[PDB]
Design a protein around this ligand. Structure first.
Ligand SMILES: CO[C@@H]1CN(Cc2cn(-c3ccnc(Nc4ccc5c(c4)c(C(=O)C4CC4)cn5CCF)n3)nc2C)C[C@@H]1O
Ligand SMILES: CO[C@@H]1CN(Cc2cn(-c3ccnc(Nc4ccc5c(c4)c(C(=O)C4CC4)cn5CCF)n3)nc2C)C[C@@H]1O
Lengths: 263, 261
C-alpha cells in the first residue's frame, strides 16, 4: 500500500508533534473525490516501527479503529490515515468539560467494540490510553496508535517482551507478558481517564509507587460524577490475576447493556 | 459498622459453604478504594460478631486484617483481600512450587502464630485451608471463627463438648483442652499438608481410626520430596505430651534457621 506522493498534499501548519515525529492534516486524491487525511511524518528503528505499525493497521478493518490509507516514501517516511478531525480524546475532554456522562459511556463503549474486534483478531494494542483514542465526532471514537501493537503467534495468547507504566497490568511490569487481558487493564485506566475528563492517572506518583499501591490491593478512586456501574467496571478491569480478569467480550457486553439502559 | 454504600460486591462468588459465601469486593477507604474479601452470612450472627471481635484485637503482617462488619441485606465480615486464596487449593494447582517456597510460607505462618501465642489467643482451626496467599511468597492466617482469648490464669481454653479432628492434638480430643501447644500440633498437620501440595491428611481414615493410630504412637509418613528437616519438625509438633511439645517460639526458630540455609 505504497502511495503516490504526487497525489498527497500536506497542509503547512502541523496538528501536533512529539518524540514520534509530526502529525499534519493533508488531502489524498483517490478514485474521483479527495479524502482528508492525517499524516504521521517521521523526523534507524523508527522507519521499521512505522512499517510494522502500517502492517498492523492494514490487517484491521473495523469502524472503531483508525483506517490506514497507506505508506508514502518520499522526502520523509509518512503514514497516511483517514482523518479523525477532533483529535485525541484526552485533550478534547480537557477542553470540553460539558460532555455528559451518557456521551462518555457511548465513547468508551465504542472503544470496547474496537477492542473486542482487536481481541478476536488476536492483536494486542499495548498502548491503550485516552491519548490514543481519536474523535471523529463528539459521538464517534476510534482507537489509534498501533506502533506498539503485536500480532499474537498462532500458538500463544501473549506477547513476551525481552526487556507507560501507569497503564500497564502487573503481569506486564513483572513478567513482560502482554495479552488482550493486559489491554483490558489499560482499558480500565482509559475509562478512568475519560470519566475524569482527560486528567492523568495516579497523579503525582512514580511508577514504583503505582506498582506498590496496586500490590497492596488499592485502586484509584471513583471520578467525580462517574456512574457507579462504570466505576465498578473499571475495578473489574483492574483484577490483579490475569485469569479472573474479564476479556473484551465481557467488557463490551457490560458496556453495551449499561449504555442501552441509560438510552 | 461499615456503610453498605461504600462497598461493591462482585456477582461471582469466590467460594461457599455452611458458613455462607465469600465474595470479592471493593470498599471505599479514606481516598483509595481497597480490594476486600467479604464473608457473607446467608439469612451464626453472634459467631460472626465474635470472629470480628477477635480480628479487631490482632495486628500482624501474617494475619488477615479485618476492615469491619457490615449489616445490610446480609451480615458481612469485610477483610483485606488475600488474592490467591487458600493455601491447600493453590498448591494443588501449582505442583511446581519449590520446597524452598513452601518453607518460606510455613515459616510465615509460624511467625503469625508466634504472635498469636504471645497475644495469648488460641486459633483452634489451624489448617492449610485457613492459610491465605497474598502472593506466592506471602501467606496470612485467616478464619478466627473458633479462636478464643485465654484467661489471665490459664494457658488453655476448656471446650464444652463441628471439630476438624484430623488437625486436633490428643488433649483436644480427650480433655477438650485448647492451648497454643495444641495449635502447634495443628501446625504440624498444616506443614504436612503444605509439603503434600494440599492433599488431605490421613487419607481414607475415619476420625476414630486417626485417634487410635495416634494413640499407638504412629504418625503420617514423609511427603514425597519433602525435606528431611521439615518432616522432623512435623514429628516434633506431633509430640503426644503437651508439656514436651514445642511452642511456636521454638518452631519459628527452627524454620527460620533451616530457611536461612
Ligand atoms: C495523543 O495521541 C497522538 C496520536 N499519535 C499520533 C497520531 C495521530 N494520528 C491520527 C490519525 C487519524 N486522525 C488523526 N486526527 C487528529 C486531529 C487533530 C489533532 C491530532 C490528530 C493531534 C495529534 O495527533 C497530536 C498529539 C500529536 C492534534 N490534533 C489537534 C487537536 F488536538 N490523528 N495517528 C497517529 C499515530 C501520537 C500522539 O500522542
Ligand atoms: C478454604 O478456606 C476458606 C476460608 N474461609 C472463608 C474465609 C475467606 N476469607 C478471606 C479473607 C481474606 N482474603 C480472602 N481471599 C480469597 C481469595 C480467593 C479465594 C478465597 C478467598 C476462597 C474461599 O474462601 C472459598 C473456600 C470458601 C476461594 N477463593 C478462590 C480461590 F480458591 N479470603 N476469610 C474467611 C473467613 C472458610 C474456608 O475454610
Amino acid at each position: 500500500v505504497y502511495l503516490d506522493r504526487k497525489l498527497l498534499t500536506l497542509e503547512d501548519k502541523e496538528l501536533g508533534s512529539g518524540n514520534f515525529g509530526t502529525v499534519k492534516k493533508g488531502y489524498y486524491q483517490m478514485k474521483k473525490v479527495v479524502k482528508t487525511v492525517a499524516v504521521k511524518i517521521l523526523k534507524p528503528a523508527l522507519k521499521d516501527e512505522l512499517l510494522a505499525e502500517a502492517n498492523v493497521m492494514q490487517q484491521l478493518d473495523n469502524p472503531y479503529i483508525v483506517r490506514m490509507i497507506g505508506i508514502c516514501e518520499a522526502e520523509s517516511w509518512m503514514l497516511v490515515m483517514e482523518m479523525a478531525e477532533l483529535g485525541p480524546l484526552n485533550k478534547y475532554l480537557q477542553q470540553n468539560r460539558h460532555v455528559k456522562d451518557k456521551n462518555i459511556i457511548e465513547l468508551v463503549h465504542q472503544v470496547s467494540m474496537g477492542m473486542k474486534y482487536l481481541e478476536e483478531s488476536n492483536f494486542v494494542h499495548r498502548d491503550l490510553a485516552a491519548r490514543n483514542v481519536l474523535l471523529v465526532t463528539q459521538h464517534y471514537a476510534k482507537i489509534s496508535d498501533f506502533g506498539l501493537s503485536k500480532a499474537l503467534r498462532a500458538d500463544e495468547n501473549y506477547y513476551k517482551a525481552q526487556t507507560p507504566v501507569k497503564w500497564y497490568a502487573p503481569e506486564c511490569i513483572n513478567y513482560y507478558k502482554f495479552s488482550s487481558k493486559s489491554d483490558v487493564w489499560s482499558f480500565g485506566v482509559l475509562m478512568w481517564e475519560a470519566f475524569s475528563y482527560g486528567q492523568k492517572p495516579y497523579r503525582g506518583m512514580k511508577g514504583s509507587e503505582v506498582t506498590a499501591m496496586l500490590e497492596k490491593g488499592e485502586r484509584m478512586g471513583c471520578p467525580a460524577g462517574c456512574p457507579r456501574e462504570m466505576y465498578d467496571l473499571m475495578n473489574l478491569c483492574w483484577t490483579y490475576d490475569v485469569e479472573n480478569r474479564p476479556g473484551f467480550a465481557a467488557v463490551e457486553l457490560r458496556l453495551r447493556n449499561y449504555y442501552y439502559d441509560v438510552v
